[PDB]
């Protein structure tokens, strides 16, 4: 522990919306300090979204205006994508970093496959 709960795959309709769940159980002493969502480009995961103490940032231009990440409750950092494009099909990684009181960081990630259905 902690571990992320993310489904193996999700579907969304072309030009519609989809949610990519990413949830976890908050743990005493584990302060969430970073969230990233990444898209897989071959061997390399590429950040598309970052949340840190400065707020939320979309990191790849093709997702501008189309990406939100849940922030109402601790432990839910699910990603919402809108106006889905066929080229949004990909493996996506949810990645969360926590810091404990001693300054150690703990990182967890988990993958889903998004399939965009015409």
């Amino acid at each position, epitope marked *: *522990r902690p*571990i992320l709960e*993310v489904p*193996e795959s999700v579907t969304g309709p072309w030009k519609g919306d989809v949610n990519l769940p990413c949830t976890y159980d908050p743990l005493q002493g584990y302060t969430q300090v970073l969230v990233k969502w*990444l898209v*897989q480009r*071959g*061997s*390399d*995961p590429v950040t598309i979204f970052l949340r840190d103490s400065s707020g939320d940032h979309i990191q790849q231009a093709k997702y501008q205006g189309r990406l939100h990440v849940s922030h109402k409750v601790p432990g839910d950092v699910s990603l919402q994508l809108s106006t889905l494009e066929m080229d949004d099909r990909s*493996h996506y*990684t949810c*990645e969360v970093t926590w810091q404990t009181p001693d300054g150690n960081q703990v*990182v*967890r*990630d*988990k*993958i*889903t*496959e998004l399939r965009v259905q015409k």
Partner: nanobody
Amino acid sequence: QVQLVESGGGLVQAGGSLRLSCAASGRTFSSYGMGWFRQAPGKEREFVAAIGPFGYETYYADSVKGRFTISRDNAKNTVYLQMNSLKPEDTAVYYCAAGRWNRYGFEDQDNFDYWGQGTQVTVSS
């Protein structure tokens, strides 16, 4: 439906080697990370090695680095552990496991959703 089936354990002399195999069936595991763990009787299970889903990314416990090699053939959904330069303290039950981590958390047993049955490795002088 899903099972991870291990094989290849047995008795070897120190300095010898074994190949463990973990055949995963019931679904495609090409985009899963795979791991090996080991446990001695009455002791805690501990990390041995892992291989990520993407690229060519392998990870090892310090105690086995340079001696053990994890590898996979995705066309057969099988992960291997080549255990070279074996030592008596490598004696344990070895388990494979599969999960959907990418780069992180591969030593956390909670992060693997499917586990093999274990196979016994014994190394004698």
